[PDB]
Symmetry: D2
Subunit: 123 residues, 4 copies
Amino acid sequence: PLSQEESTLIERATATINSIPISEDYSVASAALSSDGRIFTGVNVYHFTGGPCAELVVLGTAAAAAAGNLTCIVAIGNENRGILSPCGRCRQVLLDLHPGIKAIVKDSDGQPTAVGIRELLPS
Amino acid sequence: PLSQEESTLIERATATINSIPISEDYSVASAALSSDGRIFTGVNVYHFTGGPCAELVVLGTAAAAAAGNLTCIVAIGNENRGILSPCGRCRQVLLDLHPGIKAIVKDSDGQPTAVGIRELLP
Amino acid sequence: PLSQEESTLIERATATINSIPISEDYSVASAALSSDGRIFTGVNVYHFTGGPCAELVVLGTAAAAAAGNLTCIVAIGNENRGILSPCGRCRQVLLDLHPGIKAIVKDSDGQPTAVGIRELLPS
Amino acid sequence: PLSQEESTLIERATATINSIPISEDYSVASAALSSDGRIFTGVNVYHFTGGPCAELVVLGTAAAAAAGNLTCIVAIGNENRGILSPCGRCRQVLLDLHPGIKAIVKDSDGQPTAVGIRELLPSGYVW
Ligand SMILES: OC[C@H]1O[C@H](O[C@H]2O[C@H](CO)[C@@H](O)[C@H](O)[C@H]2O)[C@H](O)[C@@H](O)[C@@H]1O
Ligand SMILES: [Zn+2]
Ligand SMILES: [Zn+2]
Ligand SMILES: [Zn+2]
Ligand SMILES: [Zn+2]
């Protein structure tokens, strides 16, 4: 079971993706919590040259607000796809820029769980 | 001569980058105008795997607000560097996702000018 | 016009892409000439995180061979599409890593022409 | 430990990085094995827009030779760094384009070991 704040991240990212026109280019929303309690959101920008995932848009949005360290992040796909784990590129960026962060993923029983980013890039 | 709305983008991006701690990871801010007159901002996220430029963070921010078409964009560097012309990657993404967009760049005299994205990427 | 080496690069890139199975992931080939008298090829690797274009594969292939300075490059699309201009990300990488390079693109008449890389990223 | 064929990948990538000038742009070599036993190499191309890691250059090099499925890959760093585990971006591209592939990494004792790509991305991103 997630913390109350972590649950609100899922709610916020879900509301964000549900709110925008269905799009092939803008198909995932993300929300992150800063250590001060603020929440930052974002949607991906698909492009073959590596347009940012929603998580990276969130990182730049948090940075624009001088948010500092982020503690948890989640991504939610459109059309009711629900929680999506961060992709490998986002794992690398998250580890490198916010090594203390957790990402919300679905556990082996399909239940949301916040996992330390290092555990998502094991040896 | 920049329009009032375009000038506001420079003000906003400048305020954004000047408001955050000096960082090697977060070093450029961008601001874009949507067709309905809203303004969206963002800061870059440097990473060797292709962390997004500030422009791309702006595009995802606008998309999160269902902004639709963006009509003009600018990027401002930290440490009082002023207007930075979008890199080739950004030019391609901008052309592909907002073909009607203009980017604010410095003209030959160092003064702001808004140019069609196609002019930056023939 | 068009020099012998420029026409040869087109032939090499064309032969490369036409020699592989039709694929949505591997759909463009590139060839580049080095100042030390070698030609390097590559095919793109499509991925949403920014899998490299054919030109970037060529740059890494030249680098693996200690090729130094690339003087001309071209990309050819699969299914007989012919010359493709380098995308914006490739233009940036080429400018930064091989500023002396020319890229073969189509002119206003649709005929091959070698242009300085800076011409493809005007101010 | 490693199979004879897997070992040759380390040899080939090590040779490659030790055969180029020391560079901040070109700093890692990689080599992969196809099902037919062919080896394909590559070196990274550093760029802030996401210049490819050595592994991705290997993928495009294999693709140019109609190699088909790759079974194992390794990356070897310059400055005599030895084996480098594929970064998160490379893990995703490798999993997506060659889901059966193994990556050679260092074990707890610093010795080479071949691990399935899926093991390097637990709780995987899959739409
Ligand atoms: O019947 C068509 C395909 O169905 C499955 O794949 C789809 O559904 C998956 C589970 O939701 C998605 O992950 C995937 O993206 C879809 O393509 C099946 O696994 C495929 O083999 C079928 O072609
Ligand atoms: Zn991602
Ligand atoms: Zn850029
Ligand atoms: Zn390209
Ligand atoms: Zn990598």
